[PDB]
């Protein structure tokens, strides 16, 4: 029993954080094989021309207490990519993986390319995601992991004045309508992951969590007119099909369950709880309430 | 900016995790130098667990009755003995990924990080609390038995806590690493409650030092109490007492944020009577306490 914000273990990718300096900007990287990934802000915009003026012994790597020697350079989108002469011998077995808004991923915070904390978080709707980070975070790594592969979906850059974080893949694609530069931008207006929602009432009920249940059903069409009206995301016959294996566990169908979803949001919890918490969780999609509920190992 | 449950990086401990196998029972030990700590209770059967003589159920035992694997190596028992609920088996290798640790006892309130395992195999991570009544609100399954708590100053791993059992109400009790239970519990499943469990008072003065840290004062008010009165008001929402030592414990953040300790009290004890008023607080409807004022520091400073 008991259900917990849970990240993955942090370990395979400890492994591959290291220090990159520029100039007077120190920031964290990602060490796999013989290259070092890092946000191209290190450099700092006319990225490829502040580039030029580069050379391999200006970008100075530090892995634990060791310098590595840098033997050349290039940019992939928003990410700079840094050629060591020594391949990591920690180096997972990995991914490059983009992510869709309402996944989750662990997040190994860093500074100094030193591991300080892990937490869980979800990509936001509105492509931000809700982390703790502070100056020296950039460059720290987001991540899932599936058997022993690491699949690397985020790199930290920035924090948007609302106090939220915004990032790239690790191909250097930001998620959402963001740039790496200092200028007016703003997160759009976010919307709840209802999927995730619906997980999160199917924890509940494997928990023994049940006095919002109800005898009502409801249609996928008047459920979507209810929660377009409390601003949670549309509910598709995809994510339907995606709870499928909750809803045989626990006897009660997805459309079931989006009737107490619908009187929450009509009603409120009115003083009660739901896992000990008097908000709607948003961020445990269907796989981590399965995997939680059934302890997968890594 | 931001502030999230965070837990210590696992790495130190996933490189200790194995697996400890005795008889039908399967659950996880912690390998340090030469040693595998694991609850006692690993030498228990069907019909062991209500009275166990754990004394009488070890001297039958031989150290190749116990099987210890580190991924896909066993490991040679060359020993054992039992410290209180903890048995300790000396194994032929010392193991290489031994991190600079301690043994620490913590105390309620303290938080800590969990690595939820599973046939010695780490599955996940997350952050809890000693709850008062000695208990902790764990997310655990069948076979987590001898999963560990820890934290992390620097380099040096404190090992605080190992799983031991889940009580009827779905919480969690367990020893330090030296095998003395926290709380009155025994490694029986005789009949055991955990007491009425109350809110960490320190820790919720902490959060909301957070809230301000980060920009967040709708809740302050213009009032003052005294350390009396304001435990007085607490003690009927079910808070922990507030001592001098918390009002001292409190004393940086007090002073980074310009709001005395008794004034944060007295906005505390207004939340109590008010509620949010369909306002949040870091993002949360219900007042957090498993963040102590030294997590709090560490998130928002460094
Ligand atoms: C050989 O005996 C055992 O292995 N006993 C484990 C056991 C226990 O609580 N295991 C579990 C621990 N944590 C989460 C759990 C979630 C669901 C189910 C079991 C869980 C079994 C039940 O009664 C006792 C009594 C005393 C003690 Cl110290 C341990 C236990
Ligand atoms: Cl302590």
Redesign the interface.
């Known amino acids: 029993?008991?259900?917990?914000?849970?990240?993955?273990?942090?370990?395979?990718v400890?492994?591959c954080m290291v220090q990159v300096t520029c100039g007077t900007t120190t920031l964290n990287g990602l060490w796999l094989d013989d290259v070092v990934y890092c946000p191209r802000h290190v450099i700092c915009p006319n990225y490829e021309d502040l580039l030029i003026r580069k050379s391999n012994h200006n970008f100075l790597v530090q892995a634990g207490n060791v310098q590595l020697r840098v033997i050349g350079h290039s940019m992939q989108n928003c990410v700079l990519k840094l050629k060591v002469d020594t391949a990591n011998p920690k180096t997972p077995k990995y991914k490059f993986v983009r992510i869709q808004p309402g996944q989750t991923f662990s997040v190994?915070?860093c500074?100094n390319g030193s591991?300080?904390?892990?937490?869980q978080?979800a990509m936001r709707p509105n492509f931000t995601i809700?982390?703790?980070?502070?100056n020296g975070s950039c460059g720290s790594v987001g991540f899932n992991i599936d058997y022993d592969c690491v699949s690397f979906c985020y790199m930290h850059h920035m924090?948007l004045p609302t106090?939220?974080?915004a990032g790239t893949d690790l191909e250097g694609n930001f998620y959402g309508p963001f740039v790496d530069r200092q200028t007016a931008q703003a997160a759009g207006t976010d919307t709840t992951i209802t999927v995730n929602v619906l997980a999160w009432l199917y924890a509940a009920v494997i928990?023994?969590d049940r006095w919002f249940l109800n005898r009502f059903t409801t249609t996928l069409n008047d459920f979507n007119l209810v929660a377009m009206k409390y601003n949670y995301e549309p509910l598709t016959q995809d994510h339907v099909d995606i709870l499928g294996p909750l809803s045989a566990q626990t006897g009660i169908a997805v459309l079931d369950m989006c009737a107490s979803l619908k009187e929450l949001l009509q009603n409120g919890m009115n003083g009660r709880?739901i896992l000990?918490?008097?908000?709607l969780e948003d961020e445990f999609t269907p796989f981590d309430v399965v995997?939680?509920?059934?302890?997968?190992?890594?």
Not at 1 to 12: D, I, L, Q, V, Y
Not at 115 to 119: A, D, E, L, R, T
Request: net charge positive; with cysteine.
């Open positions: 029993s008991g259900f917990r914000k849970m990240a993955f273990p942090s370990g395979k400890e492994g190994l915070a500074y591991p300080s904390g892990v937490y978080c809700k982390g703790s980070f502070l924090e106090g939220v974080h928990n023994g709880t000990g918490s008097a908000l995997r939680q509920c059934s302890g997968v190992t890594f």
